Amino acid sequence: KKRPEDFKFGKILGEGSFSTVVLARELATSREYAIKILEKRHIIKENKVPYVTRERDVMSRLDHPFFVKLYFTFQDDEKLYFGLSYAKNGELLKYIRKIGSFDETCTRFYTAEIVSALEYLHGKGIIHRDLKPENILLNEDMHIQITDFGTAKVLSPESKQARANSFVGTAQYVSPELLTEKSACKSSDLWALGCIIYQLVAGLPPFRAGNEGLIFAKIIKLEYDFPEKFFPKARDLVEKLLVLDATKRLGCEEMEGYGPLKAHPFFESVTWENLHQQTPPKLT
Numbered sequence: 001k002k003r004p005e006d007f008k009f010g011k012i013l014g015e016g017s018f019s020t021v022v023l024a025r026e027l028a029t030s031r032e033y034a035i036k037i038l039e040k041r042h043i044i045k046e047n048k049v050p051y052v053t054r055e056r057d058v059m060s061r062l063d064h065p066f067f068v069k070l071y072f073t074f075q076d077d078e079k080l081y082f083g084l085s086y087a088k089n090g091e092l093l094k095y096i097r098k099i100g101s102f103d104e105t106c107t108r109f110y111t112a113e114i115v116s117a118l119e120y121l122h123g124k125g126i127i128h129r130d131l132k133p134e135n136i137l138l139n140e141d142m143h144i145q146i147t148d149f150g151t152a153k154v155l156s157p158e159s160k161q162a163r164a165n166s167f168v169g170t171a172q173y174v175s176p177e178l179l180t181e182k183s184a185c186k187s188s189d190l191w192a193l194g195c196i197i198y199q200l201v202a203g204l205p206p207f208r209a210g211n212e213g214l215i216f217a218k219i220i221k222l223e224y225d226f227p228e229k230f231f232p233k234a235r236d237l238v239e240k241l242l243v244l245d246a247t248k249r250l251g252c253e254e255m256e257g258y259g260p261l262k263a264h265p266f267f268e269s270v271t272w273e274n275l276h277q278q279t280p281p282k283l284t
């Protein structure tokens, strides 16, 4: 079991509402980690215990190159510590903001990596539920590292669970089924995927308004459109993901899963095997 004094801490990488992620070097190995640190007092007082336990449980199940890895956990009197892989190039969102619109090849490359990651996650019976560019980090080689699993859900194989009842997510990316039936499912992540593809090309996600309530209203009416020059194969894919009926989204279980999704013409050029070993196109 590791201890705080086993590390030298460097710069703060980011701060959440109830967490702080700091860059750290382990003295005995010289390895770098992003260590996420939570104050026990704050977690208890503010009803966050279930989210911390959830995050640990979900991440412990993950063993795929496109996800942040949880290497170890420890605690002292005041704090809990998650030792995570360090994604040196930060959030995908920052690149979307800087560049405004990814070209087709960069759009396809990152879409493909997200699809690959979702194939794995859903194959393990896990829903992310808060997929968004802020939660898609980038490692030193510019491959994705998906993060933020405190609001993910492990669906129970014992009961053949398909639906989850917790209300979680981010307004711009939240699915219509969560807003109207008050449940999410694997296909809810595919809705978010469609929002993300759209945003890579269009700069802003599809359902656009200045507060959460206005966005909710647009989502349930499928109120959005495409800017000019939106790559046609990408547009077709988005239209097959942003479908109000969650059982009709390309990639969902009722549509026979990821095979048909990976077969979409948008991914014609993609070699899905060893995707994480391919050199990524330059953003930038």
Ligand SMILES: Nc1ncnc2c1ncn2[C@@H]1O[C@H](COP(=O)(O)OP(=O)(O)OP(=O)(O)O)[C@@H](O)[C@H]1O
Binding pocket: 013, 014, 015, 016, 017, 018, 019, 020, 021, 034, 036, 068, 084, 085, 086, 087, 088, 090, 091, 137, 147, 148
């Ligand atoms: N493994 C990592 N490598 C590099 N940076 C990270 C890593 N994990 C998190 N960060 C950065 O630290 C910031 C805070 O992450 P954390 O999950 O602790 O809180 P959050 O989810 O951003 O905040 P909130 O809880 O309010 O949603 C993130 O915005 C991210 O940019």
Ligand SMILES: O=C(O)C[C@@H](Cc1nc2cc(Cl)cc(Cl)c2[nH]1)c1ccc(Cl)cc1
Binding pocket: 040, 041, 043, 044, 048, 049, 050, 052, 053, 056, 073, 074, 075, 080, 081, 082
């Ligand atoms: O396996 C371990 O190392 C201990 C566990 C158990 C654990 N102890 C806790 C104390 C508090 Cl105050 C809150 C939570 Cl969510 C707690 N979870 C633990 C440690 C660290 C982290 Cl980040 C999560 C869970």
Ligand SMILES: O=C(O)C[C@H](Cc1nc2cc(Cl)cc(Cl)c2[nH]1)c1ccc(Cl)cc1
Binding pocket: 093, 096, 097, 098, 099, 100, 172, 203, 204, 205, 207, 208, 209, 210
């Ligand atoms: O999507 C983000 O959260 C990143 C930011 C800020 C931003 N996000 C928005 C989402 C919506 Cl729905 C609407 C507006 Cl006006 C929004 N402004 C942003 C601004 C400009 C550009 Cl080109 C890209 C991203």
Ligand SMILES: [Cl-]
Binding pocket: 094, 095, 098
């Ligand atoms: Cl940037």
Ligand SMILES: [Cl-]
Binding pocket: 168, 169, 170, 171, 174
């Ligand atoms: Cl929401």
Ligand SMILES: [Cl-]
Binding pocket: 163, 177, 181, 183, 184, 185, 246
């Ligand atoms: Cl549902």
Ligand SMILES: [Cl-]
Binding pocket: 232, 233, 236, 237, 265, 266
């Ligand atoms: Cl097409």
Ligand SMILES: [Cl-]
Binding pocket: 116, 272, 273, 274, 275, 276
């Ligand atoms: Cl892969």
Ligand SMILES: [Mg+2]
Binding pocket: 016, 147, 148, 149, 150
């Ligand atoms: Mg988080």
